[PDB]
Structures are given as structure tokens and as C-alpha cells.
């Protein structure tokens, strides 16, 4: 398991946490020094628990699929919560088995569902460590009507931070304040599957993508990414989704 405690948290301790989270994920290969995640694992190997404790020392445990870094659900005390999707119901066979209550959330874990449910787009939802504290509180004392926004903070603070060094650094920087994510962060989030696919192809294609990926940079300009010498590849993306989980 991996743990993070928000009380006494610093930029350093968050980075340590995100490192351990990455180390928790199994990989057979590295392509261009980036961990390539596994395609398939049996149930007993497939899930990792991360425990997150807020300033008030209230703890939730979150189940992630180690092949795609997707959050499957979480536990708060004696109640488990799972997303309403097929991979989450599979997860429910393996994690949080001793929970007395299990609730299935009214939506899957994808952003378009969550943003609709929250009634807020990602760019308008504060991130930063105080934001993560608030999300943990909201999920611990589950209120249906706040859960979706809190789940989006949780996902971005764990899974998305794991996938990209830039997102890790941007969230970790905000210890005592919060911030709205730029479109650079949103486009990295949007483009993980595509980047992963093209990087795997590039390794067979002299470092060249078969199909470009358009990202938005920190100056807000659309940039076209076509090979592994681009900065997003050399210095940013930290995990590769296996092409077999692309469909």
C-alpha cells in the first residue's frame, strides 16, 4: 500500500508520495526510459490501495487498477464506494471485501460523466494540497451532490500526477493555497492514451509518431507533437499505458 498524510505535508512529501505510487505499479519494459504498464494481471495482482489522511486525521482508502492507474472506488470506514462501470464491479471482487455497506455510484469514472455530474468543468475546479484535504473530507462524509467534484480532485491529485511530472509538480507546489488548472494540464490529461500509443509506435518507427498529438503548452498555444525528442516525451510523461488497453 502507499500512504499520504496531509497534516504536515510539504512539496517534498507529496513528491515522495507520487514516487512511491509510481513504484507500486508493475512494468516489464521501459520505452525511452518510461515505464510501460502491463496489459493484463490476475485479480490478486491487479489492484493497489492508497491511504489518504486529511488535516482532521480522517482517512479514506482508494483502490487503483495498476494496469491503467484508474481509480476504481474508495472506502470510508465500513462503507465502500465503486464507480458504476464494468471494471469497477470486477474490482469489487478483490478489494474492500470486509466492508459492511457497498454503494455503487451513479456514474462511471470518466471525466465527461463526472463533469456533468459535478456541473463544473475541470478548469474551474481548484487543485492543490488544501483542495485534496477538502476532497477527502467530502468523500469521507459522503454527500452525493459534492462527490463528483471531489472525485475529480482525487483523480487529478493521484492518477494524473502519477502519469505526468508536470502535473505532480504543479499540484505539489500548492501546499497552503489552491489553483485552477491551465489548459496545459487539461490537454495532458486528455492525451495520455494517445501519447502512450504513439510512443510505443515510435519505438518501432525510428522515434517518429505515426499520428501527431496536439497539446496545449504553458503559453496556451496548440503545439503538434510528432516524435520522442519532444519535451513532453523526454521530460514529462512518466508512465505509458500499454497499447493493449488502447482499443
Positive or negative, the Cα torsion across 111, 117, 122, 123?
positive
Instruction: Decide if 85 is catalytic.
Output: no
Measured distance CA(66)–CA(234) in Å, rounded: 23
Instruction: Give all strands (DSSP E) within 169-221, no chain letters.
Output: 208-216
> Between β-strands 79-82 and 70-76, what pairing exists: parallel, antiparallel or unpaired?
antiparallel
Q: Which CATH class is domain 163-247?
A: few secondary structures
Q: Do residues 227 and 190 make contact, with C-beta atoms less than 8 angstroms apart?
A: no
Any idea where the domains of the chain sit in the sequence?
1-162, 163-247
Measured distance CA(63)–CA(75) in Å, rounded: 8
Residue from 85, 160, 168, 189 carrying the catalytic annotation: 160
Superfamily of domain 1-162: Ricin (A subunit), domain 1 (3.40.420.10)
Q: Which residues contact 16 (CB under 8 A, 6 or more apart)?
A: none
Report the 10 Å Cβ neighbour count for 210: 11
Q: Measuring CA to CA, which residue among 10, 105, 5, 16 is closest to residue 58?
A: 5
Q: Measuring CA to CA, which residue among 56, 54, 57, 92 is closest to residue 75?
A: 92
Positive or negative, the Cα torsion across 218, 197, 152, 119?
positive
Given this chain, do its domains 1-162 and 163-247 carry the same CATH topology? no
Q: Which residues contact 38 (CB under 8 A, 6 or more apart)?
A: 26, 27, 28, 66, 67, 242
| End-to-end Cα distance, the chain | 30
Nominal resolution in Å?
Answer: 1.6
The cell for 222 is 496548440
The experimental method is X-ray
> Between β-strands 59-65 and 101-104, what pairing exists: parallel, antiparallel or unpaired?
unpaired
The DSSP annotation for 31-85 comes to ETTEEEEPS---HHHHEEEEEEE-TT--EEEEEEETTTTEEEEEEETTEEEE-SS
Amino acid at each position: 500500500d502507499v500512504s499520504f498524510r496531509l497534516s504536515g505535508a510539504t512539496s517534498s512529501s507529496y513528491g515522495v508520495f507520487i514516487s512511491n505510487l509510481r513504484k507500486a505499479l508493475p512494468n516489464e519494459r521501459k520505452l525511452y526510459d518510461i515505464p510501460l504498464l502491463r496489459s493484463s494481471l490476475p485479480g490478486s495482482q491487479r489492484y493497489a490501495l492508497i491511504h489518504l489522511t486529511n488535516y482532521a486525521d480522517e482517512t479514506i482508502s482508494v483502490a487503483i487498477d495498476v494496469t491503467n492507474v484508474y481509480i476504481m472506488g474508495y472506502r470510508a470506514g465500513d462503507t465502500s464506494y465503486f464507480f458504476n462501470e464494468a471494471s469497477a464491479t470486477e474490482a469489487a471482487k478483490y478489494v474492500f471485501k470486509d466492508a459492511m455497506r457497498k454503494v455503487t455510484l451513479p456514474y462511471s469514472g470518466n471525466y465527461e460523466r463526472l463533469q456533468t455530474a459535478a456541473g463544473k468543468i475541470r478548469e474551474n475546479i481548484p487543485l492543490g494540497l488544501p483542495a485534496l484535504d477538502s476532497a477527502i473530507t467530502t468523500l469521507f462524509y459522503y454527500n452525493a451532490n459534492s462527490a463528483a467534484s471531489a472525485l475529480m480532485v482525487l483523480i487529478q491529485s493521484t492518477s494524473e500526477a502519477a502519469r505526468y511530472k508536470f502535473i505532480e509538480q504543479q499540484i505539489g507546489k500548492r501546499v497552503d493555497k489552491t489553483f485552477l488548472p491551465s489548459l496545459a494540464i487539461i490537454s495532458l490529461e486528455n492525451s495520455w492514451s494517445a501519447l502512450s500509443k504513439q510512443i510505443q509506435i515510435a519505438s518501432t518507427n525510428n522515434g517518429q509518431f505515426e499520428s501527431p498529438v496536439v497539446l496545449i503548452n504553458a503559453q496556451n498555444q496548440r503545439v503538434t507533437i510528432t516524435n520522442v525528442d519532444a519535451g513532453v516525451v523526454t521530460s514529462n510523461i512518466a508512465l505509458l499505458l500499454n497499447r493493449n488497453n488502447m482499443a
